[PDB]
Short mmCIF file of C-alpha atoms and ligand atoms in Angstrom, two decimals:
data_model
loop_
_atom_site.label_atom_id
_atom_site.label_comp_id
_atom_site.label_asym_id
_atom_site.label_seq_id
_atom_site.Cartn_x
_atom_site.Cartn_y
_atom_site.Cartn_z
CA UNK A 1 -16.70 10.27 -2.53
CA UNK A 2 -18.65 7.84 -0.19
CA UNK A 3 -18.03 4.08 -0.99
CA UNK A 4 -21.57 3.19 0.18
CA UNK A 5 -23.23 5.85 -2.07
CA UNK A 6 -21.15 6.27 -5.27
CA UNK A 7 -19.90 3.75 -7.85
CA UNK A 8 -16.27 2.91 -8.66
CA UNK A 9 -16.48 5.02 -11.87
CA UNK A 10 -16.69 8.07 -9.51
CA UNK A 11 -14.43 6.80 -6.65
CA UNK A 12 -11.29 5.50 -8.47
CA UNK A 13 -9.28 6.00 -11.66
CA UNK A 14 -10.86 4.57 -14.87
CA UNK A 15 -8.45 1.57 -15.18
CA UNK A 16 -8.98 0.78 -11.49
CA UNK A 17 -12.82 1.08 -11.81
CA UNK A 18 -12.78 -1.65 -14.50
CA UNK A 19 -10.14 -3.77 -12.64
CA UNK A 20 -12.24 -3.72 -9.46
CA UNK A 21 -15.60 -4.51 -11.18
CA UNK A 22 -15.71 -8.04 -9.56
CA UNK A 23 -15.69 -6.40 -6.08
CA UNK A 24 -18.05 -3.48 -6.83
CA UNK A 25 -20.69 -4.81 -4.38
CA UNK A 26 -17.92 -5.67 -1.85
CA UNK A 27 -16.61 -2.04 -1.88
CA UNK A 28 -20.20 -0.81 -1.25
CA UNK A 29 -20.43 -3.41 1.60
CA UNK A 30 -17.22 -1.94 3.09
CA UNK A 31 -18.93 1.52 3.00
CA UNK A 32 -21.79 -0.03 4.99
CA UNK A 33 -19.25 -1.60 7.41
CA UNK A 34 -17.68 1.82 8.14
CA UNK A 35 -21.18 3.38 8.51
CA UNK A 36 -21.99 0.63 11.10
CA UNK A 37 -18.69 1.27 12.97
CA UNK A 38 -19.57 4.99 13.32
CA UNK A 39 -23.17 4.13 14.35
CA UNK A 40 -21.69 1.81 17.06
CA UNK A 41 -19.32 4.53 18.40
CA UNK A 42 -16.02 3.41 16.81
CA UNK A 43 -13.86 5.41 14.40
CA UNK A 44 -11.64 4.44 11.48
CA UNK A 45 -8.51 5.59 9.63
CA UNK A 46 -7.71 6.89 7.17
CA UNK A 47 -10.48 9.46 6.48
CA UNK A 48 -13.23 8.02 4.20
CA UNK A 49 -12.10 10.20 1.21
CA UNK A 50 -8.51 8.67 1.47
CA UNK A 51 -9.47 5.00 1.94
CA UNK A 52 -9.32 4.16 -1.81
CA UNK A 53 -6.59 6.76 -2.62
CA UNK A 54 -4.09 4.12 -3.89
CA UNK A 55 -6.60 3.42 -6.71
CA UNK A 56 -6.69 7.16 -7.83
CA UNK A 57 -3.27 6.69 -9.56
CA UNK A 58 -3.50 4.98 -12.96
CA UNK A 59 -3.90 1.19 -13.02
CA UNK A 60 -2.15 0.96 -16.43
CA UNK A 61 0.97 2.80 -15.06
CA UNK A 62 1.62 0.46 -12.06
CA UNK A 63 5.08 -1.24 -12.38
CA UNK A 64 5.75 -2.02 -8.70
CA UNK A 65 3.26 -2.84 -5.91
CA UNK A 66 4.28 -2.38 -2.22
CA UNK A 67 1.87 -4.16 0.16
CA UNK A 68 1.72 -3.69 3.89
CA UNK A 69 -0.74 -4.92 6.51
CA UNK A 70 -3.16 -2.06 7.33
CA UNK A 71 -3.07 1.70 7.84
CA UNK A 72 -1.20 3.55 10.57
CA UNK A 73 -3.34 3.37 13.76
CA UNK A 74 -2.39 6.85 15.10
CA UNK A 75 -4.74 9.70 14.14
CA UNK A 76 -2.99 12.06 11.69
CA UNK A 77 -0.66 9.40 10.14
CA UNK A 78 -2.65 7.34 7.57
CA UNK A 79 -3.29 9.12 4.22
CA UNK A 80 -4.56 6.18 2.06
CA UNK A 81 -1.11 5.43 0.53
CA UNK A 82 0.58 2.62 2.46
CA UNK A 83 3.43 3.82 4.77
CA UNK A 84 3.07 7.43 3.58
CA UNK A 85 2.51 10.42 5.89
CA UNK A 86 1.76 14.10 5.19
CA UNK A 87 4.92 16.10 4.53
CA UNK A 88 4.48 18.07 7.86
CA UNK A 89 4.37 14.84 10.01
CA UNK A 90 7.22 14.44 12.52
CA UNK A 91 8.36 12.36 14.14
CA UNK A 92 8.05 9.68 11.47
CA UNK A 93 6.24 6.48 12.43
CA UNK A 94 8.84 3.86 13.50
CA UNK A 95 7.99 1.55 10.52
CA UNK A 96 8.67 4.46 8.13
CA UNK A 97 11.96 5.34 9.83
CA UNK A 98 12.94 1.66 9.33
CA UNK A 99 11.87 1.78 5.60
CA UNK A 100 14.00 4.91 5.11
CA UNK A 101 16.97 3.29 6.96
CA UNK A 102 16.81 0.42 4.43
CA UNK A 103 16.24 2.91 1.52
CA UNK A 104 19.55 4.68 2.38
CA UNK A 105 21.47 1.38 2.92
CA UNK A 106 20.14 -0.06 -0.35
CA UNK A 107 20.24 2.91 -2.74
CA UNK A 108 22.90 5.13 -1.11
CA UNK A 109 20.51 8.13 -1.19
CA UNK A 110 20.40 10.58 1.72
CA UNK A 111 17.58 10.21 4.26
CA UNK A 112 14.38 11.72 2.77
CA UNK A 113 13.40 15.25 3.94
CA UNK A 114 9.92 14.01 5.04
CA UNK A 115 7.59 10.97 5.06
CA UNK A 116 5.52 11.86 1.96
CA UNK A 117 5.73 8.92 -0.49
CA UNK A 118 3.53 10.56 -3.18
CA UNK A 119 6.58 10.70 -5.55
CA UNK A 120 6.56 6.88 -5.58
CA UNK A 121 2.77 6.79 -6.30
CA UNK A 122 3.23 9.35 -9.11
CA UNK A 123 6.03 7.10 -10.64
CA UNK A 124 4.04 3.80 -10.91
CA UNK A 125 4.44 2.36 -7.39
CA UNK A 126 1.11 1.15 -5.95
CA UNK A 127 1.17 1.81 -2.17
CA UNK A 128 -1.34 -0.79 -0.98
CA UNK A 129 -2.28 -2.38 2.36
CA UNK A 130 -3.86 -5.86 2.56
CA UNK A 131 -6.64 -4.16 4.63
CA UNK A 132 -7.56 -0.49 3.89
CA UNK A 133 -9.01 0.70 7.23
CA UNK A 134 -8.12 0.35 10.95
CA UNK A 135 -9.70 1.52 14.24
CA UNK A 136 -7.54 4.20 15.89
CA UNK A 137 -4.91 2.80 18.31
CA UNK A 138 -5.78 -0.87 17.35
CA UNK A 139 -3.51 -2.41 14.68
CA UNK A 140 -5.21 -5.17 12.62
CA UNK A 141 -8.67 -4.31 14.13
CA UNK A 142 -10.31 -4.50 10.62
CA UNK A 143 -8.62 -7.81 9.57
CA UNK A 144 -11.23 -10.21 8.21
CA UNK A 145 -13.99 -7.56 7.74
CA UNK A 146 -14.12 -7.77 3.91
CA UNK A 147 -11.17 -5.68 2.57
CA UNK A 148 -9.14 -8.85 1.75
CA UNK A 149 -11.45 -9.66 -1.20
CA UNK A 150 -10.91 -6.09 -2.54
CA UNK A 151 -7.10 -6.15 -2.37
CA UNK A 152 -7.04 -9.77 -3.72
CA UNK A 153 -9.06 -8.51 -6.77
CA UNK A 154 -6.65 -5.54 -7.13
CA UNK A 155 -3.60 -7.92 -7.28
CA UNK A 156 -5.29 -10.44 -9.56
CA UNK A 157 -6.26 -7.65 -12.02
CA UNK A 158 -2.72 -6.16 -12.00
CA UNK A 159 -1.21 -9.66 -12.53
CA UNK A 160 -3.55 -10.33 -15.52
CA UNK A 161 -2.44 -7.10 -17.38
CA UNK A 162 -0.19 -7.54 -20.48
CA UNK A 163 2.60 -5.80 -18.52
CA UNK A 164 5.47 -6.64 -16.18
CA UNK A 165 4.79 -6.38 -12.42
CA UNK A 166 7.05 -6.60 -9.40
CA UNK A 167 5.44 -7.04 -5.95
CA UNK A 168 7.12 -6.20 -2.62
CA UNK A 169 5.14 -7.98 0.16
CA UNK A 170 5.96 -6.74 3.69
CA UNK A 171 4.69 -9.08 6.43
CA UNK A 172 2.43 -12.10 6.70
CA UNK A 173 -0.88 -10.45 5.67
CA UNK A 174 0.72 -9.01 2.49
CA UNK A 175 2.28 -12.47 1.77
CA UNK A 176 -1.27 -13.96 1.43
CA UNK A 177 -1.27 -12.28 -2.03
CA UNK A 178 1.72 -14.47 -3.18
CA UNK A 179 -0.49 -17.16 -4.85
CA UNK A 180 -2.22 -14.60 -7.17
CA UNK A 181 1.28 -13.49 -8.44
CA UNK A 182 2.10 -16.99 -9.92
CA UNK A 183 1.98 -15.92 -13.64
CA UNK A 184 5.29 -15.48 -15.55
CA UNK A 185 4.89 -11.64 -16.03
CA UNK A 186 4.89 -11.20 -12.18
CA UNK A 187 7.63 -11.65 -9.58
CA UNK A 188 7.26 -11.20 -5.82
CA UNK A 189 9.86 -10.04 -3.24
CA UNK A 190 8.72 -11.11 0.28
CA UNK A 191 10.29 -10.02 3.59
CA UNK A 192 9.27 -9.47 7.19
CA UNK A 193 7.44 -6.21 7.82
CA UNK A 194 9.44 -3.05 8.68
CA UNK A 195 7.65 -2.72 12.07
CA UNK A 196 10.11 -2.76 15.01
CA UNK A 197 8.44 -6.06 16.05
CA UNK A 198 9.53 -7.91 12.85
CA UNK A 199 12.16 -5.77 11.01
CA UNK A 200 15.21 -7.52 12.63
CA UNK A 201 13.97 -10.92 11.25
CA UNK A 202 14.83 -9.96 7.63
CA UNK A 203 13.51 -6.51 6.67
CA UNK A 204 16.87 -4.83 7.34
CA UNK A 205 19.31 -5.78 4.55
CA UNK A 206 16.48 -6.99 2.25
CA UNK A 207 17.37 -4.27 -0.40
CA UNK A 208 13.85 -4.31 -1.93
CA UNK A 209 14.26 -1.13 -4.05
CA UNK A 210 17.43 -2.23 -5.99
CA UNK A 211 16.03 -5.82 -6.27
CA UNK A 212 12.70 -4.53 -7.69
CA UNK A 213 14.63 -2.47 -10.29
CA UNK A 214 16.87 -5.44 -11.30
CA UNK A 215 13.62 -7.47 -11.74
CA UNK A 216 11.88 -4.73 -13.82
CA UNK A 217 14.94 -4.40 -16.11
CA UNK A 218 15.09 -8.24 -16.45
CA UNK A 219 11.45 -8.12 -17.81
CA UNK A 220 12.21 -5.22 -20.22
CA UNK A 221 10.53 -2.57 -17.98
CA UNK A 222 11.95 0.84 -16.90
CA UNK A 223 13.28 0.84 -13.31
CA UNK A 224 11.58 2.98 -10.62
CA UNK A 225 13.23 6.32 -9.76
CA UNK A 226 13.03 5.73 -5.98
CA UNK A 227 14.76 9.04 -5.08
CA UNK A 228 12.74 11.10 -2.54
CA UNK A 229 13.43 14.79 -1.87
O1 ODF B 1 0.28 1.97 5.80
C1 ODF B 1 0.75 1.28 6.65
N1 ODF B 1 1.22 1.84 7.81
C2 ODF B 1 1.77 1.01 8.89
C3 ODF B 1 1.92 -0.31 8.63
O2 ODF B 1 2.39 -1.13 9.61
C4 ODF B 1 1.43 -0.93 7.41
O3 ODF B 1 1.53 -2.13 7.22
N2 ODF B 1 0.96 -0.07 6.47
CL1 CL B 2 -12.61 4.34 18.02
CL1 CL B 3 0.50 4.20 -8.32
CL1 CL B 4 16.49 -10.11 -13.46
NA1 NA B 5 0.20 4.20 -11.07
#
């Protein structure tokens, strides 16, 4: 399960292993980066086994991509699926409480029971971050350390599939993927990030879930069942 030691055919789902072939060396380089962080006395999140978790759901099944910045910086929050937390986590991270506030306003569903977004992943929503690791307590600490090439390759591969795609890009780092979504089978929703620092600039009221479903149906795709327990 180590990115430095084992090839993509072992680490990620078959479709993803082929999609990410251009960045195979880059993923191994990120394994070396995290080895060097530990050797230097710094930690990272999420756990090594969860870093590539978004790519363990089938490539061919992705209909919607949600992109954030980087993983939760608090130990015990990040699980390798962007914005998701383990079902026993409480209180919810503030960004996730803001996502669920907009989920209820948009869809009219009750507040979810917990912060586990695996139902979305299991229904063709890719829960990605622009950067896939962070140092504990230090948001954006791994920006510019080599993940951007990996997530760029992930978007370009999705966008090249003979399939509709809708992208929801939360915040400025996620927005740097907008150029790779130019093709006519792809459409991108962009808003400020749901973080308390940015949410009041346009995340609240952005209705991303109903918009993504109108877009999927407009391209002849099935809408996402967003409903969480
Ligand atoms: O997974 C994530 N957790 C927290 C965020 O701010 C983010 O952009 N993504
Ligand atoms: Cl640390
Ligand atoms: Cl998925
Ligand atoms: Cl439409
Ligand atoms: Na999927």
